[PDB]
Design a protein around this ligand. Sequence first.
Ligand SMILES: Cn1c(C(=O)O)cc2cc(Br)ccc21
Ligand SMILES: Cn1c(C(=O)O)cc2cc(Br)ccc21
Lengths: 642, 645
Amino acid sequence: GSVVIVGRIILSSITAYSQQTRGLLGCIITSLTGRDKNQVEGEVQVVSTATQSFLATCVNGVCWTVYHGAGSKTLAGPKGPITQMYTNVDQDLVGWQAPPGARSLTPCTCGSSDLYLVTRHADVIPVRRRGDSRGSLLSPRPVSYLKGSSGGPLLCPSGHAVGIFRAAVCTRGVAKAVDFVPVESMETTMRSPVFTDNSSPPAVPQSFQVAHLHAPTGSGKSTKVPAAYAAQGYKVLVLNPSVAATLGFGAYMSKAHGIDPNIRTGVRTITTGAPVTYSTYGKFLADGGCSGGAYDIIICDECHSTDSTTILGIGTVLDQAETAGARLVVLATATPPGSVTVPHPNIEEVALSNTGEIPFYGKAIPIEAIRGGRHLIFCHSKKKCDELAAKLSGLGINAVAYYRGLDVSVIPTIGDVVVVATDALMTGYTGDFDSVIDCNTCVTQTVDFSLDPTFTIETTTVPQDAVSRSQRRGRTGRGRRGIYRFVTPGERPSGMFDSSVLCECYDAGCAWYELTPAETSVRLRAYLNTPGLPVCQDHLEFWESVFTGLTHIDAHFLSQTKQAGDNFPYLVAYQATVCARAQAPPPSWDQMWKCLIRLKPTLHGPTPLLYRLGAVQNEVTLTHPITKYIMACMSADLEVVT
Amino acid sequence: GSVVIVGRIILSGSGSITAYSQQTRGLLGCIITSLTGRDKNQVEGEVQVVSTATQSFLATCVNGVCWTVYHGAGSKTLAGPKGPITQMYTNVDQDLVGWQAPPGARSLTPCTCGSSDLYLVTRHADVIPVRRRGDSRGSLLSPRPVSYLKGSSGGPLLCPSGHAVGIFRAAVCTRGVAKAVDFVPVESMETTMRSPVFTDNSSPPAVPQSFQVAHLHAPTGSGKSTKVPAAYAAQGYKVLVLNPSVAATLGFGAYMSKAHGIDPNIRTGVRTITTGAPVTYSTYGKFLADGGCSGGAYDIIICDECHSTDSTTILGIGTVLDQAETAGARLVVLATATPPGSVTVPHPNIEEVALSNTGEIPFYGKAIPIEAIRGGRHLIFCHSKKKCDELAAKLSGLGINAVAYYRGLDVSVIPTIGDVVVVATDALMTGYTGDFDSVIDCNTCVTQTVDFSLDPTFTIETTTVPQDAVSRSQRRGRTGRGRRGIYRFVTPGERPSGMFDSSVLCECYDAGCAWYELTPAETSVRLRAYLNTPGLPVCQDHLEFWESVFTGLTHIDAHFLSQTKQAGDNFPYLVAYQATVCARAQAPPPSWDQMWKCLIRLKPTLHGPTPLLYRLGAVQNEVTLTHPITKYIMACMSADLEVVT
Ligand SMILES: Cn1c(C(=O)O)cc2cc(Br)ccc21
Ligand SMILES: Cn1c(C(=O)O)cc2cc(Br)ccc21
């Protein structure tokens, strides 16, 4: 899929109008071919993916738009797809060399405070400049009005570009201010080198440094490079999200490099006295982060990972490493933000068809492709894993399901098997497979500020991103020839995560790591202020404010939601506490509210509902002080992408 | 475009009822087949996954007919082997449409046994147990979020032996949780299949011996409002002619004296005459203001423009349907050019021309050539007052006599002699009767939608929607009347006709309260009559819900109510009731938008969070949810609400 020009906003006293140039059929053919013979006119383009419509603004002979809209996509152009000239995920900025015909807006220099936002509807909105990247809407407007206007210009009165619109600053669903990428950020990006080589590890600097290591899985990132640093006389800590990978680095280093390292996981610790320690982010956070003086180098491996333990773990590194006497933090990944899945020499890629014995996500699997050999099938849910493995078992194929809750001993280490797994496989099991078959979808959590009364955590099935695709396919072609079969060919942009992940960090801080919400903010700020990492809307102040109010949890409910292993154990147990103490029933009797079953005959009346973590069957009361408190928290400025 | 089969749900042949999906087309494939109507792919399976350019849903073959919901498929064709397949059955009232399937398609067959253990087959190929609790109802064994059931309209309910019981059409919701399912029973299907494909309704009915409701689907200009009462009166019958617009009411009345030889009675707010003639022209407003049917006065009631889904027309017709038999009438004629399920077909007098990007005048993403509007008397439809004023100002610059018409303007602002361009909203068709040399159409309009948003209660959202078949026909119809005309459009195509939103039911109870002195109970009776009469525009039955809401909105300030009435804006009762609660709490309104202007006077004295009852627009001020009326309306949200899927 390419980005497609589907129309234009013509600019002039600043007045505007829109001209559509493409319908649906055209847009979708042009996205697929990447070839657009249509003539480019004007400085503001109305642009489109298959999922989303937005704006693109030409300044300085570059067509700019937002990374959250365009990802790392090509622009359809005359002689074919144009690859992006600039990709800045930290600034939320992309750019393509401006197609022939397109005029540019000149940057604004003569610092005006009267700004005008051009929208997709061709409206010209007064905006008073505040900060470098902020302007206040003179007439506050509902956020929905500003949707699809991302990438549109903010103009000073002379009609010169101050920057491009990227986000609305919300009070209870009403946009009061706008967040824009400034023209100065574009200039910086135009001056930065297009390809920067981060394939080799840095030499340990004299003063503290954060370096980036972009090199494939098993290129040495986590074995050869800690070994080589130790050989120079350094103490190295290597952090990995996976227990199985941390434990497995231990035997690989004893054989390949003659170091018996320290190993640190929840399940198993080995202290040898060695200058190399492998630990998971979790066990590191459990141990209370950086040990003063213990390490010269910290290597944060798989730093594209956007689970809450990793982000909190990395943000702890970034806030504590220099004071603890470290000289080097290496953020290490094969899939940095902005990365795209490209052909692999060892991996033959084959689309699923409709012909085959085994139904799979609307397509089919031939029995021949998986009868014999060791194969991995990725499913989105545990229910799909059980159904598929039961089918395969009846069909006489030796088949096994793996997901969260299951012990990894379900997987045979040798002989024929089809493993039917969720992404839990990434942290439980280290092995590779003759083929990988991928559903190309995953379960994700999103926050919705639904004001009904407060917020909602939603569970949705979404298409995979570039990180998911590459990590799934990377289970084959590992020093062997591999096959990769897929339902769908596409991938979402990589290096972005949802605000519910922030909430999850605060939850885990409170539930597991005995971290105050204030301490969680410090660690997360460190993560957010470090470029080259995945990006999130800055909702640290809001999330801090709601967890701050969650005082005096029942330790027995918290223990129980912790033991049960499910998400948001702190939020779940804090709802249960409010219910038990209000002598009131839970939102429903789902397995989530298990901890309240011994109180089921005594709890009557409306639920003191705090927030929505699933379906609410019972009648609700909005009268609880905690509810009133989380409702006040909703008045916070929330930056939301438009 | 057409409805396109994009895949299928394969059902188990033996043992427990299980199911899997087969995806047969992608997005590109879908959109080519939608335009051409030509689908050379083979039809396998009973349950199809069908798609339009906007929604996606299910269809089930039962007895050689591929069945689905009207609210998904509208009156659209199905892509087939030798081109598009026209619908064989369209039933808006049952919410059921059917195409003759291809020879060799597999159909389900009805449930012979009549069991109470049911199974809903969803579009994700999930088979979910339902307990039957009525002819058209079933309880979900495990209640689920509504979202999960979306896209599964047209799917089958199966008995424990894999036979069709009905087709899914809606979820029954308590506060976002589907607890039950509504379906079209297989009985309703087989009725339809035994019945005439073709029904007349083109000619005015004979007056029956006893009370009957008849439908008159005849062109606008076949004299449905002039010729047909005049012919009924010439036969000795007393006839009442009801119309949405006062301009059409006075217009018809004046035509009758001029042509058909009757000085009729006129009943409108602005002009009332009693001649004692056997014909009476009236607006639905004045009819409702007079307190409905007067006993023994009329033998025949013509409800003209009965496709109109404004609150006064619905309330008007609903009253006639509830009172006419008891008042001794013999006949109710429901008269429209564009009935539910109707479709815009070509007119012989009207040339239809798509707008290009080439032209001096920017118009909704395309352009009007300046030369097209230089020559004569032309009408330009715009969705908003803003767009009208901004366009009439541009044409004023370009040396064109352009005038703006919208609600709140005098129609005398528009001339009769030729040269003119009138830039109008839909208010034109109720305010002004004249025809034009050409019509230019934006193909969009402004509508209101309810959202049950539980934040604290409900939202009335104002939104710009693609026009529907009714909108297209009525707008096009202001040209080519008896002579040649020209119709220019931005977008071809139209949404389906004869459906309206729950918020219109809200508006009826509001208008009952504000204008017509009807208790919510009284309004319920009138609307029940309207929803129970087939052949009329359709709506989700949220009568009990809306009656409960308005039942609690007591002791409104008479002054604020009179102000919202006079100002002419929507929901004058809800606006004035929210303001009443604000004033009496000394609280500010939800915002300082024009909606809340009855409080401007009081702005110095208003402080604190607004006690928010419901949302009628943006809310800028801080809110409190502790008001007894907020609590009461939150309590009303527990109602079983039927929502489509
Ligand atoms: C219920 N569920 C499953 C599943 O196994 O079905 C996977 C998963 C992931 C997230 Br994040 C949230 C909920 C989830
Ligand atoms: C503000 N507005 C306009 C306008 O002229 O802008 C048209 C319209 C129609 C409905 Br229904 C509700 C509100 C509306």
